Amino acid sequence: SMYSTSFKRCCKIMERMVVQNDQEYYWSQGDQRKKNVTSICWNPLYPDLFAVSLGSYDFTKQRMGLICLYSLKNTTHPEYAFNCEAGVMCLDFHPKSAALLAVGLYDGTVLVYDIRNKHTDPVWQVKWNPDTSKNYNFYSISSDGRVMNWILMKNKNEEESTLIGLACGLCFDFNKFEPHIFLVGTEEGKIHKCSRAYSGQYQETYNGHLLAVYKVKWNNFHPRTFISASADWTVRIWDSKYTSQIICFDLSMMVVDAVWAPYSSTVFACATMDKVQVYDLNVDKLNKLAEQKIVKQPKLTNLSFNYKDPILLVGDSHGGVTLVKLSPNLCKSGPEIKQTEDKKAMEEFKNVKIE
Amino acid sequence: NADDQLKQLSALEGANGYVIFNESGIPLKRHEKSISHEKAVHIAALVSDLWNVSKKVIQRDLKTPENDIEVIRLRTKHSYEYIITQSGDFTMLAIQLC
């Protein structure tokens, strides 16, 4: 008993025995010198916690698949990890709080792990549907398009529960206010919409610019505004209330990751080839508001902004991590906040102008 | 280096009681006695003796002699923070929020 109590003491002992005085650069290279960053995400339960996923090309190293966890104040290397020879992608976390971890395996299967613990088609996207009464539903879009969904209280999780929806696109974005409705850009050059009641209830398509779209998001503000970006480097403001898109904006690198910034400004960002092109439509026109190449390592991979501080974190194609801070571009604080609904009305005016 | 900076220092949020005391153990100014005058006297005397012990150790067998205390800031988390900053004549202490 004395050994175990000394162990419990020594645990937190080491924990804040690593944290020493610093100015606030965490450039993680745990193994991942031959890996490639596939995703970066943050945690709401722990606003100072971030989880990254990478894919490796060299098997002569530690293990296969990747899920790494670490906090902002913790040592540069990933503090906690999950060890196995299983390639793991499609990563998401428990919606209420970080208690369960869900992953969509490469062979169409799905796995779930207790965080408080030591098919001829892959899955493409994954999402939790938070039902506070109990466990929280799971939706996985496969690489053919078809959607699956289920949830089970026993997490050792059994995919016996299942439901299937006739889905054609790969990255399904869901309606923030009404989660049952979803949309997607298909390779056929359209953007389909539907919902959870029937997979065939509402099978028309959004035709803002009518291109093969491979990315969708939603303006994390008052309206029911979303965005869809195509292989043809085109970005598209799908206002849910419209069938014709608002601002058919247009820029190279729109195939790749897009995002709404965690600021009051409706800032947009695209990023490939160690280069980010950034839009602040709240202060200027649709031309790019900023652009930055990075010489740290080539071919920047996935990124992450947190609302708290502009310590923007990014990975590289070499598997490493890095971060920089440009605080002067934090916020403008007058035009972004309450004039943003007026700005969306102004975008609709720009549509009337297009006509 | 003036009462203006001192007032700013009092305005530093999170700090509860400041205690500046001459090495003789005399709390000249304060913001802890402003809540309880029997606190900073005990604290100043006890911590002056503690700093004497710290001098002994900063001069005992591993710390080369001729090396002085520079700052001994301590923190009892969830209780308070207590900075000690030695001077040639003074000792700046502060009881802040941890």
């Binding site: - | 003789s24 153990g25 005397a45 002056s48 003796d49 004497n52 012990v53 001098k55 002994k56």
Partner: protein
């Protein structure tokens, strides 16, 4: 800065009290060591039995030999020295 608050000795023995107290302060950081320094010093120079208490919040009532008692403040320490036996 010694501050005599109640002494019985002659002025020379008092001066010796404050000098030995200053030396004990120069040498020993712990009150017990200071008091033993003073007590042994006086018990050795004179003969008999001395007792020294060093504190900060302290009252007592003791018997003591005539002109063999001091209660004072050296710096900010309460020194109560006396001879009994």
């Amino acid at each position: 800065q010694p501050v005599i608050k109640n002494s019985d000795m002659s002025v020379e023995m008092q001066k010796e009290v404050e000098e030995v107290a200053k030396k004990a302060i120069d040498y020993c950081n712990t009150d017990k060591e200071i008091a033993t320094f003073i007590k042994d010093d006086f018990r050795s120079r004179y003969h008999g039995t001395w007792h020294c208490i060093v504190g900060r919040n302290f009252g007592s009532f003791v018997t003591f030999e005539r002109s063999y008692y001091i209660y004072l403040y050296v710096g900010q320490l309460a020194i109560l020295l006396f001879k009994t036996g």
